[PDB]
Amino acid sequence: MGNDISLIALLAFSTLLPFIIASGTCFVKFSIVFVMVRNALGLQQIPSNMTLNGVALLLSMFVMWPIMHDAYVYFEDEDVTFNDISSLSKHVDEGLDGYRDYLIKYSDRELVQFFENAQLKRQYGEETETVKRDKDEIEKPSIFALLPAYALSEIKSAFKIGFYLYLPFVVVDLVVSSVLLALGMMMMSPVTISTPIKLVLFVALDGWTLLSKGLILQYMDIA
Amino acid sequence: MGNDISLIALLAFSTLLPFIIASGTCFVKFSIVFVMVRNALGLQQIPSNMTLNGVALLLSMFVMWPIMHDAYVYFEDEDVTFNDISSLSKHVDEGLDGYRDYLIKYSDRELVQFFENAQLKRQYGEETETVKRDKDEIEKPSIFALLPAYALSEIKSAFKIGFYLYLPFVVVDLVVSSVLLALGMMMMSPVTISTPIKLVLFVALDGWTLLSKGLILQYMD
Amino acid sequence: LKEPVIVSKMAARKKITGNFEFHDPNALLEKLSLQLGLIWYFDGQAIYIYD
Amino acid sequence: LKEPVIVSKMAARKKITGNFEFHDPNALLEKLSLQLGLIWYFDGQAIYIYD
Amino acid sequence: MFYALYFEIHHLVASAALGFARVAPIFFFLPFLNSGVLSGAPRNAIIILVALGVWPHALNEAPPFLSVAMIPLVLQEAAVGVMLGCLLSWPFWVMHALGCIIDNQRGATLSSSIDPANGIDTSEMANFLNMFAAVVYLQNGGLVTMVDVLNKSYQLCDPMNECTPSLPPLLTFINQVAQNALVLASPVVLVLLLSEVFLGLLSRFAPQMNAFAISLTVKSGIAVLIMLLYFSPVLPDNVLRLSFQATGLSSWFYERG
Amino acid sequence: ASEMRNAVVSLRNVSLNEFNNFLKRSGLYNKNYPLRGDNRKGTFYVSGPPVYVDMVVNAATMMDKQNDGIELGRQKIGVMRLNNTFVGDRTYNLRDQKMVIPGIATAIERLLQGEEQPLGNIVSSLQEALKQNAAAGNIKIVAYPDTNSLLVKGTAEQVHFIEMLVKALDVAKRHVELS
Amino acid sequence: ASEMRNAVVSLRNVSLNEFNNFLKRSGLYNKNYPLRGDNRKGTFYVSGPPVYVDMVVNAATMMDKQNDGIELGRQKIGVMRLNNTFVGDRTYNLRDQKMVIP
Amino acid sequence: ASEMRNAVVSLRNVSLNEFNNFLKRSGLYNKNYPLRGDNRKGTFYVSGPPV
Amino acid sequence: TNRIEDPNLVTDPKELAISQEMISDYNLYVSMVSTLTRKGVGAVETLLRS
Amino acid sequence: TNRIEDPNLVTDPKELAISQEMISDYNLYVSMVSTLTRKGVGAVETLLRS
Amino acid sequence: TPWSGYLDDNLQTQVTEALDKLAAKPSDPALLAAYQSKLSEYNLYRNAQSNTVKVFKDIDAAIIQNFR
Ligand SMILES: CCCCCCCCCCCC[N+](C)(C)[O-]
């Protein structure tokens, strides 16, 4: 039997699941960094997009699955009682704070505050904002305010990281070119020589392993 | 009908019939080979799936019809044959051997053995001796164990057949790409040139004749 | 014992090792039933053993 | 005890270590019951133990 | 008891449904099972039959999971299935990488091959070697080892014990896949490099000679010629040395419950 | 050998010793797979090759239905003379009462009237048991004064019992003189 | 051995002895798997190989049903001469009252 | 040979000896597959080619 | 319940009204799980292609 | 549910006529909430897969 | 209709006869008393029969209509 509205909420949630994952989860970062590094090594389709997306997906679950499981453990709790729509709303909102905290940790306060204003202030006849003292609103930015502010910060972080990975390969390209000129062995295109070198060097140093650890250690302790 | 449960069982069977055809008949194989051919020629939407499945179902009819007819006359047969529960259950079981013989004749012996042992270890316990019937008369295995072995066996052999058909077109493609690089026209997409050569090659072979002949001769001497 | 023996699926998991002398199988059967945690019965035709 | 003994799963989760002497086992049993927080019963054929 | 057969059929379909979550992702990765080949009404009928062929418990007794939140469970099983799909895919992705390296070295950047089902870029050599490896794998009977490692995955780690893939080795996985491909491709790259520098050194005596345009004419012939000698070991060098095997399940997964 | 079939068969109008004769005359009998059971009773076990078993079970069921149509409760008419008394009822008109004395027929008939169990005995094999089952209420007695005799209709057993009772009843009376 | 079958049977018209004699005449009896119960009663326990058990159960059931066609409450007739009184009812025509003695 | 059919037939109003004469008069009788039974009774077994 | 109490209670209107609840609810539960697994697998395939 | 368990409600035409309405209104309400929810998520899905 | 392969009118004549006897002498109390009984039994027989034949038709129809 159960409740017919909680059934609707379950089925609805399970249809939106892949878009939430694709837009409000560390998958956003992991899937970007790998593809950037792959382009920088200069040989597309090695590794496959299947390999990369598969790994990125698996790693995202270590970070996110405990939070969802904690939320369901919060709701399956036979000792609660309610009296009114308000008392129920509060308890359901309280259930989501575990996720809310994660979004607050990894996103910008001022962009969040901007959208928090923009949901309302088309309504407002006034300029004063102090009118609520911060301690409530700083804790309770809405989730629709948090989501895009989180995604826009994740992308920027991804670019920051990939930038520093490009530099050494650039250096290697300059070295190769300068050597071909110093030898006067001019009429050979350097890419044919330097792409093997980039590949062998990065694999011989296990760049992918160090990269995977360096990404996860922002979100977990492996031990 | 002379009996009501005999009617209920017939309506249930007639309600599950299509999945039995989709998973325990050569249709599973013909359907794959034609899609492989379409992939090989590098086409996307033509011929349509409805046309290829049409011919695949027609060809499957010539192969399956004799045992469906045999089962039909066996169950219509008006001569007195059973009296009591043990005789009825044996009469029904005996009526299915015409089709067990089919599944067994084309299923891979190794897969049949795997799915049989893994059921024994569910029912009687994993400590029961692993049979290793390496020289074997497989003792009328259960149809729930026998059916997935057939399905994976037909998938295997259909893929195998499909592999062979690529090799000429693979040659065509690598040749064209080499002559274009020999001229330095690095910016030319080969597919534009290589598609018609594939089409005329297949037409000169008369592929569909050879292929539809052999696919049927594999099922009858 | 001079009787067929039937052992349940859940008893068959347990393992034993050693030398045993069958001077009095009835006594040995009782001792090992209490040591290993089994129950058993005898309809007059066969012996049945359970966890 | 001279009686087969049957233990609930919720009691099976608990672990114990040490060196024990089984003499006047009924007394030993009823003492451990209170220390470990078990309850037990005896119908005349076997002993049952629960959390 | 009258309704017992009715309930016994419902226990069966609940078990099959929870098995589909773990078997279908494998059918997504492998090159002879994906929907570029097996599609329409057969697809579900076959997946379900396999899942019932490997489920570990007697089908006629009540499923143990009725007391548990369904979503965390379904996601857990799907993640496990994705990990198994990768490990079973492992011999094919190496040959695909090899083919991509060769087709890149010989020029051929604008390759023609097509593949929409997996959504991955493909070249003529990559497609060829990826097919060839699959047929020799099937012909060696590996299809039995695939269902073996499926059944073992249920015996060694159970849905109800919260079985989980080990993290440390997963962090190595991509680099092992890259390494095996480079180690295997290395003989063709070196000869194609030496052939180009030889023409470069030759050009010193005739500076109007377009050594680059000459090398484009040569390199595809050299690449096929050389790959044709070291071709026959490609049978054993994949059929065993790269195939996953059921003993490996001990290290890649553990039970967390 | 794995194809061996077996069955238990039961009959209502025929005996195993009958059905054997049928098989023998037919030339279908086979001493390797004979019928096993009790000749006196209608229940037997049979086992053997399919064709043999099926034939046996068919034939035995259909012969049982054919014999089901034949009746065997042959009614027998017995004629019994009385040697010591008059067959009819008689009325004596005492001053005090109209008085009636019932004859043998009336007494016996009134006694057996509406009986439903078989008549067993008097004091002062399946094909047999199904004859012994005949109900007591069918016995019919008709007094025939013309020869001072009774007509009795029933089974051979019933008529016999009636004969005994008649000979237990028609004793010769003594004469008394009152002065 | 694991295939042993067993069952409980209860008959109304047939004695355990009757059934045992049937088996003995048949030559079907087997002293390793005899029927266990009360000779007087119709309720017994049987265990053994499949063919044996199934045959016993079918035979017993059919034999029991067959005997419903039988009746054994045989009625009996007795003649009892009164030595000390008249059999019939008697009416006494008292001048003021008619009295009847049954 | 594998097609031999056989059946048990029983008649209420017509004896076997009455039926054999019918087949003889018709010219349909065949001494390789004669009817097997009791000439007095009306129940018989026959086997042979389908027609 | 296997050979205890009795079978075949097709007929008493008080227990027959209790069976209706169970026979319906278990059919719904099993139907729901079938959809959830398809959704889950479909979400994984959606992400891996894209 | 209460309106049916209670014997004076389930046997008076005046009360039955009301219960009929309650049941129908319940049905329509739930069916419409379900429909609009599906249409809503279906819009999101249509746009994001485009 | 037979189940394929499965192993396994007097009252009408009696009523006709009694009618023919009665028609010859409608005033005989013994012929009247006899005919009353024969006709009553025949009536009950025909009714019970036709009700049963309908009940079986309606069960077969309900089965088909359940899967149709
Ligand atoms: C792989 C996703 C599906 C299984 C869910 C895994 C949840 C995360 C468990 C991480 C445990 C890490 N540990 C042992 C260091 O705590």
3-state secondary structure chain B: CCCHHHHHHHHHHHHHHHHHHHHCCCHHHHHHHHHHHHHHCCCCCCCCHHHHHHHHHHHHHHHHHHHHHHHHHHHHCCCCCECCHHHHHHHHHHHCHHHHHHHHHHCCHHHHHHHHHHHHHHHCCCCCCCCCCCCCCCCCCCHHHHHHHHHHHHHHHHHHHHHHHHHHHHHHHHHHHHHHHHHCCCCCCCHHHHHHHHHHHHHHHCHHHHHHHHHHHCCCC
List the one residue out of E109, E147, E155 whose CA is nearest residue E244.
E147
Measured between CB atoms, does B78 come within 8 Å of chain K? Answer: yes
Burial of E21 (0-12, 13-18, 19+ CB in 10 A): buried
For residue J2, give how far its alpha carbon lies from the nearest alpha carbon of chain A (Å).
17
How many whole angstroms separate alpha carbon B161 and alpha carbon A113? 63
Residues F135-165 as b or e (16 or more Cβ within 10 Å = b):
bbeebebebeeeeeebebbbbeebbebbeeb
J-chain residue closest to A23, CA distance: J48
In sequence order, the 6+-apart residues with CB closer than 8 A to the CB of A113 are A141
Taking alpha carbons only, the member of E246, E24, E239 closest to residue E151 is E246
**How far apart are the C-alpha atoms of H46 and H44, rounded to whole Å?**
7
Helix and strand totals (H; E) in chain K: 2, 0
Residue C9 to chain B, least CA–CA distance (Å) = 7
Q: Is the CB of E74 under 6 A from ligand 1?
A: no
Q: Whose CA is nearest to atom 10 of ligand 1?
A: A62
Q: Which residue of A has its CA nearest to E118?
A: A50
CB G98 within 8 A of CB G91: yes
Peptide bond into B47 cis (omega under 30): yes
Strand pairing report for F119-123 and G75-78: parallel
Tell me the two tokens of residue K55.
Answer: 């009940």
Instruction: Give the tokens for residue C23.
Output: 């001077």
Contact I48 A50 (CB under 8 A): yes
B6 and K CB contact within 8 Å: yes
CA–CA distance, E112 with B174 (Å, rounded to integer): 10
CA–CA dist E32, E38 (Å, integer): 8
Between CA E83 and CA E254 the distance in angstroms is: 13
Q: Does E21 touch chain I (CB under 8 A)?
A: yes
Residue from B23, F101, D10 nearest E38 by CA: B23
Say how far apart CA E198 and CA E205 lie, in whole Å.
12
Beta strand extents in F40-165 (DSSP E only): 43-48, 76-81, 90-93, 98-101, 119-123, 140-144, 149-154
A10's tokens: 């379950």
Closest-CA residue to E50 (of B147, A106, A51): B147
**B22 contacts B28 by C-beta, under 8 angstroms:** yes
Token digits of residue E229: 């000698």
Q: Is A67 in the pocket of ligand 1 (CB under 6 A)?
A: no
Contact E78, E22 (CB under 8 A): yes
Query: Do strands F149-154 and H36-37 pair parallel, antiparallel, or not at all (unpaired)?
Result: unpaired
Burial of D24 (0-12, 13-18, 19+ CB in 10 A): exposed
Give CA separation, A28 vs A154, A156, E86, I37, in Å. Answer: 7, 11, 21, 24
d(CA A213, CA A211): 6
Q: Which helix (H) or strand (E) holds E130?
A: helix E124-139
Q: Is the CB of E203 under 6 A from ligand 1?
A: no
Binding site membership of A62 for ligand 1 (Cβ less than 6 Å):
yes
The residue among F62, F71, F70 whose CA lies nearest residue F22 is F62
Please tell me chain A's helix, strand, coil percentages from 3-state DSSP, rounded to the nearest 5. Answer: 75, 0, 25
Give the tokens for residue A195: 């792409």
Query: Does the Cβ of A66 fall within 6 Å of ligand 1?
Result: yes
Nearest CA to E98 among E236, E234, E220?
E234
Query: Which helix (H) or strand (E) is G44 found in, with range?
Result: strand G43-48
Any atom of ligand 1 within 6 Å of the Cβ of A124:
no
Q: Which of G59, G69, G77 sits opposite F43 (nearest CB)?
A: G59
User: Is beta strand C5-7 parallel, antiparallel or unpaired with respect to C47-50?
Assistant: parallel
- Residue F152's beta-bridge partner residues? F78, F141
D5-7/D47-50 β-pairing? parallel
Which pair of structure tokens corresponds to residue B123? Answer: 């029912």
Q: Are strands F149-154 and F140-144 parallel, antiparallel or unpaired?
A: antiparallel
Q: Kindly report the nearest CA distance between residue A93 and chain I, in angstroms.
A: 25
Q: For the sheet containing G43-48, what is the strand order?
A: G5-10, G43-48, G36-37
Question: Residue B152: CB partners within 8 Å, gap ≥ 6?
Answer: B108, B111, E46, E50, E143, E147
- Between the CA of A139 and the centroid of ligand 1 the distance, in Å, is 28
Query: Torsion angle of alpha carbons A144, A147, A152, A158, nearest 10°?
Result: 180
Distance CA A223, CA E168 (A): 10
| CB atoms K6 and B82 under 8 Å | yes
**In degrees, to the nearest 5, what angle opens at C-alpha D12 toward C-alphas D32 and C13?**
130
As beta bridge partners, residue H6 has H47
Cβ pair E191, E226 in contact under 8 A: yes
Q: How many A from CA of A148 to the centre of ligand 1? A: 27
Instruction: Look at F57 and K7 and tell me if their CB atoms are within 8 Å.
Output: yes
Q: What is the largest CA-CA distance in chain K?
A: 61
Strands of F43-48's sheet in order across: F5-10, F43-48, F36-37
Data resolution in angstroms: 3.3
Token pair of F97 as six digits: 């009462």
Task: Spell out which chain F residues touch chain K, with contact meaning CB-CB distance below 8 angstroms.
Answer: 57-58, 61
Domain span at residue K14? Answer: 1-68
Residue contact G36–C44, C-beta within 8 A: yes
Contacts of A147 in chain J (CB under 8 A): none
With CB atoms and an 8 Å threshold, state whether F120 touches G27.
no
Q: Do chains G and E touch (3 or more CB pairs under 8 A)?
A: no
Q: How far apart are CA E158 and CA E257, in angstroms?
A: 10
* Nearest residue, CB atoms, F62 vs list H6, H36, H43: H43
Euclidean distance between CA atoms B163 and B155, whole angstroms: 12
Q: Which of A14, A189, A208 has its CB closest to that of E178?
A: A208
Backbone angles phi, psi at K41, to 5 degrees: -65, -45
* Torsion on CA atoms F26, F31, F33, F38, rounded to nearest 10: 90
Our measurement of the distance from residue I41's CA atom to the centroid of its chain's CA atoms, rounded to an integer in Å, reads: 21
E78 Cβ closer than 6 Å to some ligand 1 atom? no
Inter-chain touch J37–A8, beta carbons under 8 Å: yes
What residue type is F132 in one-letter code?
A: Q
Residue with tokens 């009469």: B91
According to DSSP, residue G91 is labeled E
Determine the straight-line distance between the first and last CA of chain H, rounded to whole angstroms: 14
Interface with chain A: mutation pick from I47, I49, I50, highest number of A CBs within 10 Å? I47
Residue E60, both tokens: 């006629």
Helix segments in A24-142, DSSP class H: 27-40, 49-75, 85-105, 109-118, 134-139
Indicate if ligand 1 lies below 6 Å from the C-beta of A69: no
Distance from C-alpha of J23 to C-alpha of A117, rounded to nearest angstrom: 44
Instruction: Name the nearest CA neighbour of E224 among B39, A44, B41, B170.
Output: B170
Position E21, amino acid: A
Cβ(B213)–Cβ(B205) under 8 Å? no
- Residue F153 near residue F139 (C-beta atoms within 8 A): yes
Integer angstrom CA distances of residue A14 from A63, A96, E159: 19, 17, 20
Taking the CA of residue E162 as reference, the ligand 1 atom at the shortest distance is 4
Q: How large is the C-alpha radius of gyration of chain D? A: 11
Q: Which of ligand 1's atoms lies nearest the C-alpha of A62?
A: 8
Q: How far apart are CA D49 and CA D28, in angstroms?
A: 14
- Strand, coil or helix: what is F117? coil
What are the percentages of helix, strand and coil residues in chain H, rounded to 5?
Answer: 20, 25, 50
Q: Is A195 exposed, middle or buried (0-12, 13-18, 19+ CB in 10 A)?
A: buried
What are the chain K neighbours of B1 within 8 Å (beta carbons)? 1, 3, 60
Q: Max Cα separation, chain A?
A: 87
Of E2, E74, E119, the CB nearest to I7: E2
Which run of H or E residues covers position C49?
A: strand C47-50
Q: Where are the beta strands (DSSP E) in chain E?
A: 163-165, 253-255
Phi, then psi, of B8 in degrees rounded to 5: -60, -45
For chain B, the straight-line distance linking the first and the last C-alpha, in angstroms and rounded, comes to 39
End-to-end CA distance of chain G: 76
For E74, the closest of I7, I30, I36 (CB atoms) is I36
DSSP string, E194-238: HHHHHHHHHHTT-TTS-HHHHHHHHHHHHHHHHHHHTTGGGTHHH
Contact between chain J and chain E (3 or more Cβ pairs less than 8 Å apart)? no
Name the structure determination technique.
Answer: cryo-EM
* Contact yes or no for C39 and D5 at CB 8 A: no
Verify whether ligand 1 is closer than 6 Å to residue E79 (CB atom).
yes
Mutate to test the pocket of ligand 1, among A26, A55, A65 (most ligand atoms within 8 A of CB): A65
Contact A165, A118 (CB under 8 A): no
Radius of gyration for chain H, computed over Cα atoms and rounded to the nearest angstrom: 11
Contact by Cβ (8 Å): G53, G64 = no
Residues B14, B19, B23, B29, CA torsion sign: positive
Q: What is the spatial distance between Cα F141 and Cα F150, in angstroms, rounded to a whole number?
A: 7
A·E CB contacts under 8 A: 110
Measured between CA atoms, the residue of chain B closest to residue C13 is: B127
Distance CA K21, CA K17 (A): 6
CA of G86 to the centre of ligand 1 (A): 111
Strands (E), chain H: 5-10, 36-37, 43-48
How many interchain CB pairs under 8 A, A with I? 26
Residue nearest to atom 6 of ligand 1 (CA): A62
In chain F, DSSP assigns E strands to 5-10, 36-37, 43-48, 76-81, 90-93, 98-101, 119-123, 140-144, 149-154
Cβ of F45 and G28 within 8 Å?
yes
For ligand 1, atom 7, which residue shows the shortest CA distance? A62
What are the C-alpha distances in Å from K65 to residues B17, C51, I24, K54? 19, 51, 21, 16
Sequence-separated (6 or more) residues with CB below 8 Å from residue K17: none
Burial of K58 (0-12, 13-18, 19+ CB in 10 A): exposed
Distance CA F162, CA F119 (A): 10
Q: How far apart are CA B183 and CA B179, in angstroms?
A: 6
For residue E162 and ligand 1, the question of a CB distance below 6 A is answered with: no
| Cα K18 to ligand 1 centroid, rounded to whole Å | 95
Pairing of strands F36-37, H36-37: unpaired
Dihedral, CA of residue G32, residue G33, residue G34 and residue G38, to nearest 10: 130
Are the C-beta atoms of residues B25 and B158 closer than 8 Å to each other?
no
User: Between chain F and chain G, are at least 3 CB pairs below 8 A?
Assistant: yes
SS (H, E, C) chain J: CHHHHCCCCCCCHHHHHHHHHHHHHHHHHHHHHHHHHHHHHHHHHHHHHC
Compute the C-alpha angle B169/B173/B174, nearest 5°. Answer: 120
Q: Where do runs of H (alpha helix) occur along chain G?
A: 16-26, 50-66
Number of domains in chain K: 1
Touch J-B: 3+ C-beta pairs under 8 A: no
Give the count of beta carbons closer than 10 Å to the beta carbon of residue F52: 16
Determine the residue of chain C that is closest to D7 in CA distance: C37
- Tell me how many residue pairs between chain B and chain H have CB atoms under 8 A apart: 4
Which numbered atom of ligand 1 lies nearest the CA of A220?
15
Taking a C-beta distance cutoff of 8 angstroms, is the pair E107, E86 a contact?
no
CA distance J29 to J34: 9
Structure tokens, F54: 């099926």
Using CA atoms, how far apart are residues I12 and A112, in angstroms rounded to an integer?
Answer: 65
